[PDB]
Amino acid sequence: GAMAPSYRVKRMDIAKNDEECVVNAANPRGLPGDGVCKAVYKKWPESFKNSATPVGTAKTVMCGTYPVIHAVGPNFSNYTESEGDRELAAAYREVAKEVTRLGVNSVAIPLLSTGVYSGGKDRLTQSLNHLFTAMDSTDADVVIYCRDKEWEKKISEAIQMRT
């Protein structure tokens, strides 16, 4: 575990993280994809061997000794709000299991289903709260990665408000 487990947010490419493992915002088929998924494919292409996994699940594949946790959030263009909410919460619970199993002291995480899987909606609060529900019981240092200055502010505000 981390000595004083924390949440932080950084506005940069998750492919350049300083953590002991990464969570990919994966598609169910293990394809190179778009956004976070494409950056992860470019940095850790070896981790996409047999990475295909259903919606609401996480599957870890090693790139050397560096763990890539492929977490499949729902595409809100295909799911109802209620079923999408359930699968988004489930993907994060599976991430918490994997981070625990791996025994890492830190993990780089993106906000699942906030990009091209968002169904054109702002899901910062929804996705972040499911992240907290899952990761709060873990003792890893969590570093959230985003690309927007205003999302960075909102995420930083939500972290600080609970401390």
Q: Which residues make up the interface to Cl ion (CB under 5 A)?
A: 12-13, 115, 117, 146-148, 151
Closest residue to Cl ion: CB criterion: 115
Name the residue nearer to Cl ion (CB basis): 136 or 150: 150
Cα torsion angle, 56, 62, 67, 68, sign: negative
Contact 141, 2 (CB under 8 A): yes
- Is residue 117 part of an annotated ligand binding site? yes
Round to whole Å and give the CA distance between 70 and 138. Answer: 18
Minimum Å gap between C-beta 4 and Cl ion is 27
84 is in an annotated binding site: no
85 is in an annotated binding site: no
Assign 109 to helix, strand or coil.
strand
Taking the complex as a whole, the smallest distance from the CB of residue 103 to Cl ion amounts, in Å, to: 28
Nearer to Cl ion (CB atom), residue 38 or residue 101:
38
Closest approach of Cβ 145 to Cl ion, in Å?
8
Please state the closest distance from residue 21 (CB atom) to Cl ion, in A.
19
* Residue with smaller CB distance to Cl ion, 26 or 135: 26
Residue number with CB closer to Cl ion (86 or 101): 86
Of 86, 89, 93, the closest CA to residue 69 belongs to 93
What is the distance between the alpha carbons of residues 132 and 110, in angstroms, rounded to a whole number?
A: 12
Alpha helices in the chain (DSSP H): 36-43, 81-102, 124-135, 149-161
Angle 107-66-140 from CA coordinates, rounded to 5° = 20
Which residues participate in the annotated binding site for ADP-D-ribose? 13, 27, 35, 115-117
